[PDB]
Design a protein around this ligand. Structure first.
Ligand code: CA
Length: 236
Protein backbone atom coordinates (compact mmCIF):
# COMPACT_ATOMS: atom_id res chain seq x y z
CA UNK A 1 0.00 0.00 0.00
CA UNK A 2 1.30 3.38 -1.17
CA UNK A 3 -1.14 6.28 -0.66
CA UNK A 4 -1.23 9.88 -1.80
CA UNK A 5 -4.61 11.01 -0.40
CA UNK A 6 -4.42 14.32 -2.30
CA UNK A 7 -3.90 12.50 -5.64
CA UNK A 8 -7.03 10.43 -4.93
CA UNK A 9 -9.09 13.65 -4.41
CA UNK A 10 -7.63 15.40 -7.45
CA UNK A 11 -8.57 12.39 -9.59
CA UNK A 12 -12.07 12.28 -8.04
CA UNK A 13 -12.65 15.83 -9.29
CA UNK A 14 -11.09 15.08 -12.68
CA UNK A 15 -13.18 11.94 -13.40
CA UNK A 16 -16.55 13.66 -12.72
CA UNK A 17 -15.73 17.00 -14.45
CA UNK A 18 -18.41 17.71 -17.12
CA UNK A 19 -17.94 16.04 -20.49
CA UNK A 20 -19.12 17.82 -23.68
CA UNK A 21 -22.93 17.82 -24.19
CA UNK A 22 -24.14 15.57 -26.97
CA UNK A 23 -25.69 17.42 -29.88
CA UNK A 24 -29.44 18.12 -29.91
CA UNK A 25 -30.27 18.65 -33.65
CA UNK A 26 -33.45 16.76 -34.59
CA UNK A 27 -33.11 14.85 -37.89
CA UNK A 28 -36.08 15.57 -40.24
CA UNK A 29 -37.32 13.32 -43.01
CA UNK A 30 -35.69 14.14 -46.42
CA UNK A 31 -39.08 13.71 -48.14
CA UNK A 32 -42.69 12.53 -47.75
CA UNK A 33 -42.08 8.81 -48.55
CA UNK A 34 -42.85 6.47 -45.61
CA UNK A 35 -39.34 4.93 -45.87
CA UNK A 36 -37.76 8.37 -45.47
CA UNK A 37 -40.01 9.22 -42.50
CA UNK A 38 -39.22 5.87 -40.85
CA UNK A 39 -35.48 6.45 -41.22
CA UNK A 40 -35.69 9.89 -39.60
CA UNK A 41 -37.79 8.49 -36.75
CA UNK A 42 -35.32 5.64 -36.23
CA UNK A 43 -32.52 8.19 -35.86
CA UNK A 44 -34.59 10.30 -33.47
CA UNK A 45 -35.15 7.22 -31.28
CA UNK A 46 -31.51 6.12 -31.43
CA UNK A 47 -30.13 9.58 -30.68
CA UNK A 48 -32.52 10.05 -27.75
CA UNK A 49 -31.48 6.72 -26.22
CA UNK A 50 -27.82 7.64 -26.71
CA UNK A 51 -28.51 10.84 -24.72
CA UNK A 52 -30.25 8.79 -21.95
CA UNK A 53 -27.21 6.50 -21.78
CA UNK A 54 -24.76 9.40 -21.82
CA UNK A 55 -26.59 10.90 -18.84
CA UNK A 56 -26.33 7.54 -16.97
CA UNK A 57 -22.61 7.48 -17.82
CA UNK A 58 -22.23 10.84 -16.04
CA UNK A 59 -23.96 9.32 -12.98
CA UNK A 60 -21.48 6.45 -13.13
CA UNK A 61 -18.55 8.90 -13.13
CA UNK A 62 -20.17 10.74 -10.16
CA UNK A 63 -20.53 7.38 -8.37
CA UNK A 64 -16.85 6.65 -9.03
CA UNK A 65 -15.65 10.10 -7.84
CA UNK A 66 -17.58 9.46 -4.60
CA UNK A 67 -15.95 6.01 -4.18
CA UNK A 68 -12.53 7.66 -4.55
CA UNK A 69 -13.50 10.23 -1.88
CA UNK A 70 -14.66 7.45 0.45
CA UNK A 71 -11.32 5.66 -0.04
CA UNK A 72 -9.51 8.94 0.78
CA UNK A 73 -11.69 9.39 3.90
CA UNK A 74 -11.07 5.82 5.09
CA UNK A 75 -7.25 6.18 4.95
CA UNK A 76 -7.78 9.30 7.09
CA UNK A 77 -10.07 7.61 9.63
CA UNK A 78 -7.66 4.70 10.18
CA UNK A 79 -4.88 7.34 10.41
CA UNK A 80 -32.12 1.95 -19.13
CA UNK A 81 -33.97 0.15 -21.97
CA UNK A 82 -33.37 -0.80 -25.64
CA UNK A 83 -34.03 1.56 -28.56
CA UNK A 84 -37.43 0.91 -30.19
CA UNK A 85 -37.40 -0.41 -33.80
CA UNK A 86 -39.54 1.58 -36.22
CA UNK A 87 -41.90 -0.79 -38.00
CA UNK A 88 -41.08 -0.51 -41.70
CA UNK A 89 -47.51 3.44 -55.54
CA UNK A 90 -48.55 5.46 -58.60
CA UNK A 91 -45.59 7.09 -60.42
CA UNK A 92 -46.84 10.67 -59.94
CA UNK A 93 -47.55 10.29 -56.20
CA UNK A 94 -44.08 8.78 -55.74
CA UNK A 95 -42.43 11.68 -57.60
CA UNK A 96 -44.44 14.29 -55.60
CA UNK A 97 -43.46 12.67 -52.30
CA UNK A 98 -39.77 12.38 -53.29
CA UNK A 99 -39.61 16.03 -54.32
CA UNK A 100 -41.38 17.41 -51.20
CA UNK A 101 -39.21 18.12 -48.12
CA UNK A 102 -35.68 19.30 -47.30
CA UNK A 103 -33.99 16.61 -49.48
CA UNK A 104 -31.59 15.56 -46.68
CA UNK A 105 -30.18 18.88 -45.37
CA UNK A 106 -31.14 18.13 -41.74
CA UNK A 107 -29.70 14.60 -42.03
CA UNK A 108 -26.27 16.02 -42.94
CA UNK A 109 -26.36 18.50 -40.03
CA UNK A 110 -27.33 15.67 -37.60
CA UNK A 111 -24.37 13.65 -38.91
CA UNK A 112 -21.84 16.49 -38.40
CA UNK A 113 -22.97 16.90 -34.77
CA UNK A 114 -22.56 13.21 -33.90
CA UNK A 115 -19.27 12.77 -35.85
CA UNK A 116 -17.75 15.68 -33.94
CA UNK A 117 -19.11 14.27 -30.69
CA UNK A 118 -17.32 10.98 -31.40
CA UNK A 119 -14.04 12.92 -31.78
CA UNK A 120 -14.67 14.94 -28.56
CA UNK A 121 -15.25 11.76 -26.49
CA UNK A 122 -12.04 10.18 -27.87
CA UNK A 123 -10.18 13.32 -26.71
CA UNK A 124 -11.49 13.19 -23.10
CA UNK A 125 -10.21 9.80 -21.83
CA UNK A 126 -7.05 11.04 -19.96
CA UNK A 127 -9.31 11.16 -16.86
CA UNK A 128 -9.44 7.30 -16.76
CA UNK A 129 -5.64 6.72 -16.61
CA UNK A 130 -3.87 4.82 -13.79
CA UNK A 131 -2.51 6.40 -10.62
CA UNK A 132 1.05 7.61 -10.10
CA UNK A 133 1.32 7.16 -6.32
CA UNK A 134 -1.65 5.02 -5.27
CA UNK A 135 -1.04 1.25 -5.06
CA UNK A 136 -2.79 -1.72 -3.46
CA UNK A 137 -5.97 -3.74 -3.94
CA UNK A 138 -8.12 -0.55 -3.72
CA UNK A 139 -6.02 1.32 -6.28
CA UNK A 140 -6.11 -1.70 -8.60
CA UNK A 141 -9.89 -2.15 -8.17
CA UNK A 142 -10.45 1.56 -8.91
CA UNK A 143 -8.06 1.41 -11.90
CA UNK A 144 -10.23 -1.43 -13.25
CA UNK A 145 -13.42 0.68 -12.83
CA UNK A 146 -11.78 3.63 -14.58
CA UNK A 147 -10.68 1.40 -17.45
CA UNK A 148 -14.23 0.06 -17.80
CA UNK A 149 -15.50 3.67 -18.16
CA UNK A 150 -12.80 4.49 -20.75
CA UNK A 151 -13.91 1.47 -22.82
CA UNK A 152 -17.55 2.45 -22.42
CA UNK A 153 -16.77 6.01 -23.58
CA UNK A 154 -14.83 4.73 -26.60
CA UNK A 155 -17.72 2.40 -27.49
CA UNK A 156 -20.20 5.30 -27.24
CA UNK A 157 -17.92 7.28 -29.54
CA UNK A 158 -18.05 4.39 -32.05
CA UNK A 159 -21.84 4.31 -31.81
CA UNK A 160 -21.94 8.09 -32.33
CA UNK A 161 -19.90 7.71 -35.54
CA UNK A 162 -22.07 4.77 -36.72
CA UNK A 163 -25.32 6.71 -36.16
CA UNK A 164 -23.81 9.68 -38.02
CA UNK A 165 -22.93 7.36 -40.90
CA UNK A 166 -26.52 6.03 -40.90
CA UNK A 167 -27.75 9.60 -41.45
CA UNK A 168 -25.21 10.35 -44.24
CA UNK A 169 -26.15 7.08 -45.90
CA UNK A 170 -29.87 8.00 -45.98
CA UNK A 171 -28.91 11.46 -47.32
CA UNK A 172 -26.88 9.73 -50.11
CA UNK A 173 -29.73 7.35 -50.84
CA UNK A 174 -32.09 10.29 -51.29
CA UNK A 175 -29.73 12.04 -53.74
CA UNK A 176 -29.46 8.76 -55.66
CA UNK A 177 -33.28 8.41 -55.65
CA UNK A 178 -33.74 11.92 -57.10
CA UNK A 179 -31.22 11.19 -59.91
CA UNK A 180 -32.91 7.88 -60.82
CA UNK A 181 -36.66 8.46 -60.23
CA UNK A 182 -38.68 10.18 -63.02
CA UNK A 183 -39.49 13.75 -62.06
CA UNK A 184 -43.09 14.80 -61.57
CA UNK A 185 -42.75 17.43 -64.35
CA UNK A 186 -41.38 14.81 -66.79
CA UNK A 187 -44.19 12.36 -66.01
CA UNK A 188 -47.01 14.91 -66.36
CA UNK A 189 -45.48 16.19 -69.62
CA UNK A 190 -45.70 12.67 -70.99
CA UNK A 191 -49.32 12.34 -69.74
CA UNK A 192 -50.39 15.74 -71.18
CA UNK A 193 -49.06 14.84 -74.66
CA UNK A 194 -50.76 11.43 -74.43
CA UNK A 195 -54.00 13.18 -73.41
CA UNK A 196 -53.86 15.78 -76.21
CA UNK A 197 -52.56 13.60 -79.08
CA UNK A 198 -54.64 10.45 -79.82
CA UNK A 199 -52.33 9.35 -82.69
CA UNK A 200 -49.28 9.42 -80.32
CA UNK A 201 -50.80 7.18 -77.59
CA UNK A 202 -49.75 3.64 -78.64
CA UNK A 203 -46.17 4.85 -79.10
CA UNK A 204 -45.98 7.05 -75.93
CA UNK A 205 -47.25 4.23 -73.69
CA UNK A 206 -43.98 2.21 -73.61
CA UNK A 207 -42.12 5.34 -72.43
CA UNK A 208 -44.63 5.70 -69.58
CA UNK A 209 -44.44 1.98 -68.68
CA UNK A 210 -40.65 2.35 -68.47
CA UNK A 211 -41.03 5.35 -66.12
CA UNK A 212 -43.47 3.36 -63.95
CA UNK A 213 -41.08 0.41 -63.81
CA UNK A 214 -38.12 2.66 -62.91
CA UNK A 215 -40.26 4.27 -60.16
CA UNK A 216 -41.04 0.82 -58.72
CA UNK A 217 -37.33 -0.09 -58.72
CA UNK A 218 -36.25 3.15 -56.96
CA UNK A 219 -38.99 2.83 -54.34
CA UNK A 220 -38.05 -0.79 -53.64
CA UNK A 221 -34.38 0.19 -53.12
CA UNK A 222 -35.44 3.20 -51.00
CA UNK A 223 -37.68 0.99 -48.82
CA UNK A 224 -34.95 -1.66 -48.36
CA UNK A 225 -31.93 0.59 -47.89
CA UNK A 226 -33.55 3.27 -45.64
CA UNK A 227 -34.51 0.69 -42.98
CA UNK A 228 -32.01 1.56 -40.22
CA UNK A 229 -30.96 -0.65 -37.34
CA UNK A 230 -31.71 0.82 -33.90
CA UNK A 231 -28.54 1.86 -32.03
CA UNK A 232 -28.43 -0.09 -28.75
CA UNK A 233 -25.74 1.33 -26.44
CA UNK A 234 -24.17 -0.70 -23.58
CA UNK A 235 -25.14 0.15 -20.00
CA UNK A 236 -22.42 2.00 -18.05
CA1 CA B 1 -28.52 7.02 -63.99
Amino acid sequence: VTVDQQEILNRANEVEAPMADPPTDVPITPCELTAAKNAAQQLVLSADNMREYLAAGAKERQRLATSLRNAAKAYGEVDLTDTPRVATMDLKEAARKLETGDQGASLAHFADGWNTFNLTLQGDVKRFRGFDNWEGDAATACEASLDQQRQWILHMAKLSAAMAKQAQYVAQLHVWARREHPTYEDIVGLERLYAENPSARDQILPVYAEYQQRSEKVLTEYNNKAALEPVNPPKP
